[PDB]
Amino acid sequence: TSQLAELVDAAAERLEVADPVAAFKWRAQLPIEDSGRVEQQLAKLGEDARSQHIDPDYVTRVFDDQIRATEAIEYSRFSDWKLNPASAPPEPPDLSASRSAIDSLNNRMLSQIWSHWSLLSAPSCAAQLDRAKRDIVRSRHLDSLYQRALTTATQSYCQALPPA
Amino acid sequence: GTSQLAELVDAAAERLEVADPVAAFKWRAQLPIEDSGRVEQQLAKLGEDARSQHIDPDYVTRVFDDQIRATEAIEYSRFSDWKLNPASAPPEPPDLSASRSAIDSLNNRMLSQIWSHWSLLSAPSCAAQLDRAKRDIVRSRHLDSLYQRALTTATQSYCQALPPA
Ligand SMILES: [Pb+2]
Ligand SMILES: [Pb+2]
């Protein structure tokens, strides 16, 4: 098992929430973009990082990637549902429920980042991440879109700097 | 041999291809893809255009509702792509004037073809001749899997229902 399996799995788990979020927005006719909200979600995460003495700029970069990957999945689903609306899940969970699940995933993600700091900042990170991704892509039989989204979500992981 | 519906299906496909410059503009301008009120205006004008040529406006409204949804679907797919890789979004894309003119011309080509092929669009042979036309235009325009799906959605109301006995 890759030593980055937990963090790449958490990334994938957070990507799973794009679908019910999209489903809800589709039915409610809400826009996918929410620049104000994203700006603020990243604010809290930055401050959480500072509290644990985790580099906030690294954290905000990673979560920005994560959020864009999620937005990409929502747009892809809207594309599919414009082509064939019958596919749109009729009774998705409330957006507030999805957002609370996301908040909890974020906390776990940040904890896994801190736990793996020495590895994320080590030269073996690129190799370990490619292995973690390859394993999870196969084991979850992730489709093309989710493979791409996972790449985007994890693209800044190995940018961590070792402690002073 | 060429489907009698190839000219119509080719216009539909060329009109779908306008999704690309339109999406690139909306992306840079930070505009959403959708606008229900805009689409209802566009559909209303198409109905008026149909009436002017004594084409069934309800039929034209259904066909163009499908065409517009299919176009939106392409626009959303590009937005997905550009969220994953923002550097791939076309930089400093041109404004929508060319796209506007193209859509006006293609709307007119489509409507005139619906009149020209009305008997076929109403006949049992429509389904197979639509299939033949789609195959021929997918090839001639080298349409990828996204545009193949979109062309299917755009043309799904072309063939009219037949008597049930
Ligand atoms: Pb580990
Ligand atoms: Pb899961």
Curated annotation (Swiss-Prot), chain B:
Pathway: Metabolic intermediate biosynthesis; prephenate biosynthesis; prephenate from chorismate: step 1/1. The keyword Acetylation does not apply. GO terms for biological process: chorismate metabolic process; salicylic acid biosynthetic process. Its main location: secreted. Its EC number is 5.4.99.5. Residues 1-79 form the Chorismate mutase domain. Substrate binds at R15, K26, D35, R38, V39, E40, Q41, Q42, T71, E72, A73, I74, E75, R100. It catalyses: chorismate = prephenate. Homodimer. This is Secreted chorismate mutase. It comes from Mycobacterium tuberculosis (strain CDC 1551 / Oshkosh). The chain holds residues 35 to 199 of 199 of the full protein.
